[PDB]
Design a protein around this ligand. Structure first.
Ligand SMILES: CC(=O)Nc1cccc(-c2cc(C)[n+]([O-])c3ccccc23)c1
Length: 127
C-alpha cells in the first residue's frame, strides 16, 4: 500500500548521448503527449497512497510515467531512442495491465498512445 522509490532519472556512471532521435523524442514526442488534455494522470509517478490503490505496486513492478521520461530526456539520461521508446511503452502497458477495458484511464492512455505511435512512425534517421 506504500509508494516505492521512483524510477532513476540520474546516474552519473551511465553513459549518455544527445542524438537527433532523442531530441525528437523530447521536442516532438514528449511535448505532444504532455500538452494533451488526457496527460495529467501520466505526468508523475502513480501515488498509490493518495489514489487509494494499495495493490498498484503489487501488480506494476516496472512503474513508468511521463514525469520520469521528461526528467530523463531533460537530463540526457539515455544512450538511445529505443530506451526512451521502451519507457513510453512501459507506461501504456502498465495502465492496460492494472486497469479494465473502457476505464477512463485506459481511454486516456489509448489517446496518448495513438499520438505516440504517429510520432514514432516519423522518428528521423540517425545523423
Ligand atoms: C500522483 C498521482 O498518482 N496522480 C494521478 C491522478 C489521477 C489518476 C491517476 C492514475 C494514473 C494511472 C497510470 N492509473 O493507472 C490509475 C488507475 C486508477 C486510478 C488512478 C490512476 C494518477
Amino acid at each position: 500500500s506504500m509508494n516505492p522509490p521512483p524510477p532513476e532519472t540520474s546516474n552519473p556512471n551511465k553513459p549518455k548521448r544527445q542524438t537527433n532521435q532523442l531530441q525528437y523524442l523530447l521536442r516532438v514526442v514528449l511535448k505532444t503527449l504532455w500538452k494533451h488534455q488526457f496527460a495529467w494522470p501520466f505526468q508523475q509517478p502513480v501515488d498509490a497512497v493518495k489514489l487509494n490503490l494499495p495493490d498498484y505496486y503489487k501488480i506494476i513492478k516496472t512503474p513508468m510515467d511521463m514525469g520520469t521520461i521528461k526528467k530523463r530526456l531533460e537530463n540526457n539520461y539515455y544512450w538511445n531512442a529505443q530506451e526512451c521508446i521502451q519507457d513510453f511503452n512501459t507506461m501504456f502497458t502498465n495502465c492496460y495491465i492494472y486497469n479494465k477495458p473502457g476505464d477512463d484511464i485506459v481511454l486516456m492512455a489509448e489517446a496518448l498512445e495513438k499520438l505516440f505511435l504517429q510520432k514514432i512512425n516519423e522518428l528521423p534517421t540517425e545523423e
